[PDB]
Specification:
10 strands, acetylation, 127 residues, Trefoil (Acidic Fibroblast Growth Factor, subunit A), globular
Length: 127
């Protein structure tokens, strides 16, 4: 597993058993342990190690935790000069919708994200 740390609000990406996606600052949270799994080079699923759920973004730009993988669960990974990664929705890449966390640790919605934001920067860390 890895943790995905957002420096915008200082939160680890979290997928809860009920499929809620948000952020917590607590390093010890069981639900922040993630597996980044390759499809093709630079394409990844982001999977909850605890629940088995996959991070996904819906057609309304909303993040949720999917019981099973689908086309909404693929993200295009990029590093990013300062060691942080970005994750753009594969399905909505043309809109530049990203995985992001607000300063208050709740998720960002696709249209409210874009290249250049701190919200979209995640640092993969060891558990």
């Amino acid at each position: 597993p890895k943790l995905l740390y957002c420096s915008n609000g200082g939160h680890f990406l979290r997928i809860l058993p009920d499929g809620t996606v948000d952020g917590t600052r607590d390093r010890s949270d069981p639900h922040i342990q993630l597996q980044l799994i390759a499809e093709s080079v630079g394409e990844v699923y982001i999977k909850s190690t605890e629940t088995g759920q996959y991070l996904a973004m819906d057609t309304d730009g909303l993040l949720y935790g999917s019981q099973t993988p689908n086309e909404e669960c693929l993200f295009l990974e990029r590093l990013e000069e300062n060691g942080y990664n970005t994750y753009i929705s594969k399905k909505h890449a043309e809109k530049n919708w990203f995985v992001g966390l607000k300063k208050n640790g709740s998720c960002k919605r696709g249209p409210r994200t874009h290249y250049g934001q701190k919200a979209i920067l995640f640092l993969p860390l060891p558990v």
